[PDB]
Amino acid sequence: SPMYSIITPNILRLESEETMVLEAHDAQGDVPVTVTVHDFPGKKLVLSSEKTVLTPATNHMGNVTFTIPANREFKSEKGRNKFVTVQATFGTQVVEKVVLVSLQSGYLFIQTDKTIYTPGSTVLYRIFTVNHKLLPVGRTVMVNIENPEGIPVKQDSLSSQNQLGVLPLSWDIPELVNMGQWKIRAYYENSPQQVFSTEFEVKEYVLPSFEVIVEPTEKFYYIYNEKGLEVTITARFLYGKKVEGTAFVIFGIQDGEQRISLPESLKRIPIEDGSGEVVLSRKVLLDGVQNPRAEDLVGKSLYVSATVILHSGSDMVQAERSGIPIVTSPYQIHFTKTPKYFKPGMPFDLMVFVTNPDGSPAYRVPVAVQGEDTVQSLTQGDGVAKLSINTHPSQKPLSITVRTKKQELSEAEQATRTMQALPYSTVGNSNNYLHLSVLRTELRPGETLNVNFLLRMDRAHEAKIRYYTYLIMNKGRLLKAGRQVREPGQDLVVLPLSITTDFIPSFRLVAYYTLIGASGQREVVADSVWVDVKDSCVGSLVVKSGQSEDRQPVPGQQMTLKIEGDHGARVVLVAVDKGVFVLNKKNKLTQSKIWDVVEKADIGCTPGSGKDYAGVFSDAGLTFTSSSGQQTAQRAELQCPQ
């Protein structure tokens, strides 16, 4: 008995290109399918209509791409939840699934010319308007400027149409203005709930002539370190020359929001050849706090303030280095990249992420699984190690403990972490499972990654599985889908997947197979895997000197700026005095910020696997529906749980 199935993203976006994947199982000849999308529950209007015929030559696999109309006729509010009915009909056989709708229509990014402004001056800004594909788009944007109190002082409704995705604006700061952190907040008109923001400080100031860099010798403070916290002070003119002067350095403890100053830490040191050294003593620190137990300081942070005065007395610069964490270990372990579900009897893959106390990845750090012999694994550049443990077949919950194996460290100093993984629940004790595995090396576009498919199931019903089908989730949508062929008797199969700039910054691969169960009922088995891809710009943009004289320019001199980029690209520029950044380096725009915004919006909520097949689908942001009644549960929330 032939079975018809449809797979779509768990969440459907307005004004965004979406794809629906249609599959026929055990079907002969051409199959005609008509797919329509309607509003739920009113069915008042057809949002989209498309048709496609599955041919036996294509290996019975089809897709229909549709964009929900921008119109958003279905009214927003009270916010959530909007739904649509998705219907696919294959040769008079109807399969329908109700899917959740997100009104979000793309991304906005805000760029100001500086990070801080004086009253009376002008804030120049640009609003980059892109879709979920990160491509320039012409839409209507609501823009607000908010005071430190949070009140909107200015409200505009603009269009980026014909602006090549770049909306240049400006705001004049009144001479009499409330100081503080001001916010620029913009949103797509159609998607009022998704607000994108940036901040700028308003303050009376003058630019300093030099910068002060205060850096501890260690990114953290070990609580049992007798030496105390050593801090280096560096002072240099913005034009590169070293500073001679006097520095005042003071320390404090930060616990949450509160800050406790350490008066006795105050020291006055000479800055010679642009350099100075200063120490916070363990005794002073420990005397600063009311609690006699030093261990209570763990989890808290230290901050250092340095004020440097030029010998002329003409210029003074204050600089702070904060969030120096107080630790009992120079390392942290994270299981944020490992699946929380294992399949009994099949190797379980742990994706250990080892970091420094500042959040940065840790390189060449040995890591092992506790309760198990050997299994040492080093860390990659991204601070990622891969571990594998063989599991006994049984529904018993899995408790894994990972510890660092750093040679120069005491056992009390090593980092440790424990996670629990639940058994994948098969249908009717079928004891059938699919498992996906990947090499986990640092991944870049232009390279191909092998994806390994391994199945464990009763050998009597084994012969039935001719293929697997895989779906590639990326930036909230389906990017690719396909099939991987397996002959009977073949436990392991390998799919080579070419990786492109479309895979940036990460993707999930969801594979499944279906068969006729021992119950006589239909049976679907699935697994999902998550893989990181190295961040970079899609395409390239580089700025350097065109003169190439290698000699330093003088004031008022003309020079040649060389820009290299993709053809036809619109390039916007700004030149900023470094002193501004000496005063404020918050809210600068970078590519990594963009990729972060993208990763936060992701539909998929887990690293992989699930409680059941439906769990696997939903977790990676998919809806599966079949004629036999096997479907994922309805998704309650737009936000990822946690």
């Binding site: 990160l134 005042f248 690209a569 916007v572």
Partner: protein, 902 residues
């Protein structure tokens, strides 16, 4: 000479914090996939490192942020002019021009100059430059202090130039600084008015008169700004809770029967879908389930078609005579189900047509000839009393439900509705049962025909103003109350609604069960409609205008609910009273706050530190400099700084400095002590603390190595390290105890002291032709004849109020006729002036002698200003002398009649 002349030096002046805000495109043809753009840019004047950031947008490639590109702009010799963000007007201040020499093996002998600016008292003037010659060792810097006094507010210019002897090298720096008025900025709230035109205003109009701000302590000649702030205050309406989804689970039923039974089973399923759709409660119920509900409904409909008779009416069995009620009910239900499934237009409209043409009497009444078997299913209609009104009402309602669907097919429909409405209207006042009152009330409300005494009977009939009830089945009362709720909703009487809705929900009735169809259908339709008609927020539509006496056209602001948060501001420089008028529905907030500069006592300056500085002759000239500072806090200050700058040509005693450095509780850098006697004229002394209970004092000798004609006052600044803003600065000078540059002040205006005294002359006497020659000179702006009205005294000036009797020659100032002008003279110039009130005078002078702008504009009696006593007519006629008076007459005549020639 061997040095570049000042004029030849073009100062650096372009110091923007940001620039190159440019949009470019990679139009250039690309090798591979990359296109290279070469841009020619002119660098700014700043000496620093620029961060150049680029962001690209591509339709194929997307958005890309490039890595920041740095450009360092550097110079072997330069001036860093360190200016504060702002300076107070008429307050002496010290600034630093720091000179940098970054040559490794070459010292630089340099002449540095502060340019003269009429807006600043400084050393430099128009007649004389302020130049110094200094020497800078290699890999070193030198601080050159300038003491100035800002004379006018706004952006003012400071320029410092420097050139190198024996080297074709120079640099200049031209910067602006904000000069602000004295006193402290204050915000004074003139008024706070709640805007509620319906609640606070007659005839929907609210008027508020806002008074002018009382600026009693406001500094003279200071701009004030009045800010008018409008905001809308959003008010969200509270709606009653919707019935939970789980509680309609039992309402989903599979229809079976029997023309009547099928409808009994069809009723709950249809109304449940209706309520869930309306309240969007399909999520908790289960989305997948909705499909299901539908085909039950479909089933029912299909099945019901079996009991449709050739007349298009309905009955339990095909053999049975058709029921008016059951037919009208099939209409009601099908009409409500027309959204959910495809209903045949012919069936519904056929039933309607049958009801009208077959069952409606000439008076509008509908009649039942074949009552249904299941009396239960007709709920409140079961009562024998007032059957005509109740059944006519019911059928009419069914008709209203079908009007939009059947208006074209059925011609008799508008007339029927009207006819029924007439019968309801005619006999409504005689009703004695709450049920009939409620249902007929709803029917009449649908036609907008429920008004006046009828409306009052309807409302009055409600017990406790929450329900419509009668003795008997509770279900009948639920049904009736649902009808009345629908009526109130139709009437939009939202004030009467909330207790009624609360009561229905309080009953906790969820339909289903024997004899429940009417109560179910009606309660759920009524609640669904409540949800539909419910407002989430109160209406905010405001039109607010403010009328300003300064502006002819009023400013109009419309405040709506979406933009309610948005702050609207209007600003007026004039402190004038105005009126604000608000119209429309909603709530608003008006706030009027005036920002002004207020004269402050005690003085702002030195609030954290007391600082006394003294310079005294010491027992080759040497003096003793004493510095006494006291912190004004509750406890001793932490580590602090004394920034000391020497008088011109003075250096600290080296031995004194060393002994001070070895002294405990203070520190002087090895850098300072190592430095030679010259050319460093700045010294920083770091204090480990500053006492708060007594003056901390120190003293050292200073040696005059260089002699100059003009000596710039030295300065001492004290501040704690953590707060540079909270400082105190004192000046010191031998000739002047205060250290203050000589200046004169009148009211809020100050000018640099100059030798411009009126010249007294003459014993020998003067000719008419000299007057004619001098007055006709181009430099002379005005020539007047006037009388001294009043002589007044100022701190630095003598004032003479002159009523201009005749304008012999008129200047830029227009005195017209008989107006008054104030002529002033410095106290040091008293002996030369001889003025008496009530006496006439011929005066004339230069435009350069003007001071300030009207009002209180002054004429300065300087050296070039002519003042001559004019004898009275009686006196003029006598001897001693007739000559002077005749000469004044001729002077006058010649001047007005012929004037001056080109």
């Amino acid at each position: 000479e061997d040095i570049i002349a000042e004029e030849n030096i073009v100062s650096r002046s372009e110091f923007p914090e940001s620039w190159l805000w440019n949009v470019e495109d990679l139009k250039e043809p690309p090798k591979n996939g990359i296109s290279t753009k070469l841009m020619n840019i002119f660098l700014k004047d700043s000496i620093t490192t620029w961060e150049i950031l680029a962001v690209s947008m591509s339709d194929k490639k997307g958005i890309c942020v490039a890595d920041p590109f740095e450009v360092t702009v550097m110079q072997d010799f330069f001036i860093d002019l360190r200016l504060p963000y702002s300076v107070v007007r008429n307050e002496q201040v010290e600034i630093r021009a720091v000179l940098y020499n970054y040559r490794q093996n070459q010292e630089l002998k340099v002449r540095v100059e502060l340019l003269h600016n009429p807006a600043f008292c400084s050393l430099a003037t128009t007649k004389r430059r302020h130049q110094q010659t200094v020497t800078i060792p290699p890999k070193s810097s030198l601080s050159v202090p300038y003491v100035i006094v800002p004379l006018k507010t706004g952006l003012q210019e400071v320029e410092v130039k420097a050139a190198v002897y024996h080297h074709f090298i120079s640099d200049g720096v031209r910067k602006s600084l904000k000069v602000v008025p004295e006193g402290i900025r204050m915000n004074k709230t003139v008024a706070v008015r709640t805007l509620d035109p319906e609640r606070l205003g007659r005839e929907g109009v609210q008027k508020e008169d806002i008074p002018p701000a009382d600026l009693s302590d406001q500094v003279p000649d200071t701009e004030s700004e009045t800010r008018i702030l409008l905001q809308g205050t959003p008010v969200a309406q509270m709606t009653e809770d919707a019935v939970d989804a789980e509680r309609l689970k039992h309402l989903i039923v599979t229809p079976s029967g029997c023309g009547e039974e099928n409808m009994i089973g069809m009723t709950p399923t249809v109304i449940a879908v209706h309520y869930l759709d309306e309240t969007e409660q399909w999520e908790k119920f289960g989305l997948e389930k909705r499909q299901g509900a539908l085909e039950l409904i479909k089933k029912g409909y299909t099945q019901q078609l079996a009991f449709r008779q050739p007349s298009s009416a309905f009955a339990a069995f095909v053999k049975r005579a058709p029921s008016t009620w059951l037919t009208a009910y099939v209409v009601k239900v099908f009409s409500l189900a027309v959204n959910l499934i495809a209903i045949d237009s012919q069936v519904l409209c056929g039933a309607v047509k049958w009801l009208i043409l077959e069952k409606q009497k000439p008076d509008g009444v509908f009649q039942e000839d074949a009552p249904v078997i299941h009396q239960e299913m007709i709920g409140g209609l079961r009562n024998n009393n007032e059957k005509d009104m109740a059944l006519t009402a019911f059928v009419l309602i069914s008709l209203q439900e079908a009007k939009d669907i059947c208006e074209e097919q059925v011609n008799s429909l508008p007339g029927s509705i009207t006819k029924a409405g007439d019968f309801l209207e005619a006999n409504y006042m005689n009703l004695q049962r709450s049920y009939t009152v409620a249902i007929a009330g709803y029917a009449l409300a649908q036609m907008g025909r429920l008004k006046g005494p009828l409306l009052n009977k309807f409302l009055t009939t409600a017990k406790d103003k929450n329900r419509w009830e009668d003795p008997g089945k509770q279900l009948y009362n639920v049904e009736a109350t649902s009808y009345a709720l629908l009526a109130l909703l139709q009437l939009k009487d939202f004030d009467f609604v909330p207790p009624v809705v609360r009561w229905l929900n309080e009953q906790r009735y969820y339909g289903g069960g024997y004899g429940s169809t009417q109560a179910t259908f009606m309660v759920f339709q009524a609640l669904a409609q409540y949800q539909k008609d419910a407002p989430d927020h109160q209406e905010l539509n405001l039109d607010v205008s403010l009328q300003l006496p300064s502006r002819s056209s009023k400013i109009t602001h419309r405040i709506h609910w979406e933009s309610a948060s948005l702050l609207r501001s209007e600003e007026t420089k004039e402190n004038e009273g105005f009126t604000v008028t608000a119209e429309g529905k909603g709530q608003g907030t008006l706030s009027v706050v005036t920002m002004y500069h207020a004269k402050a006592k005690d003085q702002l300056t030195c609030n954290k530190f007391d600082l006394k500085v003294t310079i005294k002759p010491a027992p080759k000239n040497t003096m003793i400099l004493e510095i006494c500072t006291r912190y004004r806090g509750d406890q001793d200050a932490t580590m602090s700084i004394l920034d000391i700058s020497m008088m011109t040509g003075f250096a600290p005693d080296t031995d004194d400095l060393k002994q001070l450095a070895n002294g405990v509780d203070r520190y002087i850098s090895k850098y300072e002590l190592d430095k030679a006697f010259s050319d460093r004229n700045t010294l920083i002394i770091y204090l480990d603390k500053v006492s708060h209970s007594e003056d901390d004092c120190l003293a050292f000798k200073v040696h005059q190595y260089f002699n100059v004609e003009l000596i710039q006052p030295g300065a001492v600044k004290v501040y704690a390290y953590y707060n540079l803003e909270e400082s105190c600065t004192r000046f010191y000078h031998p000739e002047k105890e205060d250290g203050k540059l000589n200046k004169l002040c009148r009211d809020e205006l100050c000018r640099c002291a100059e030798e411009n005294c009126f010249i007294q002359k003459s014993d020998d006497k003067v000719t008419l032709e000299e007057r004619l020659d001098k007055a006709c000179e181009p430099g002379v702006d005005y020539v007047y004849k006037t009388r001294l009205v009043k002589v007044q005294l100022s701190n630095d000036f003598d004032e003479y109020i002159m009523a201009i009797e005749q304008t012999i020659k008129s200047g830029s100032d227009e005195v017209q006729v008989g107006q008054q002008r104030t002529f002033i003279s410095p106290i040091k110039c008293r002996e030369a002036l001889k003025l008496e009130e009530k006496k006439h005078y011929l005066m004339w002078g230069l435009s350069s002698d003007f001071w300030g702008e009207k009002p209180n504009l002054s004429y300065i009696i300087g050296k070039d200003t002519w003042v001559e006593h004019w004898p009275e007519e009686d006196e003029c006629q006598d001897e001693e002398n007739q000559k002077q008076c005749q000469d004044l007459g001729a002077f006058t005549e010649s001047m007005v009649v012929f004037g001056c020639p080109n």
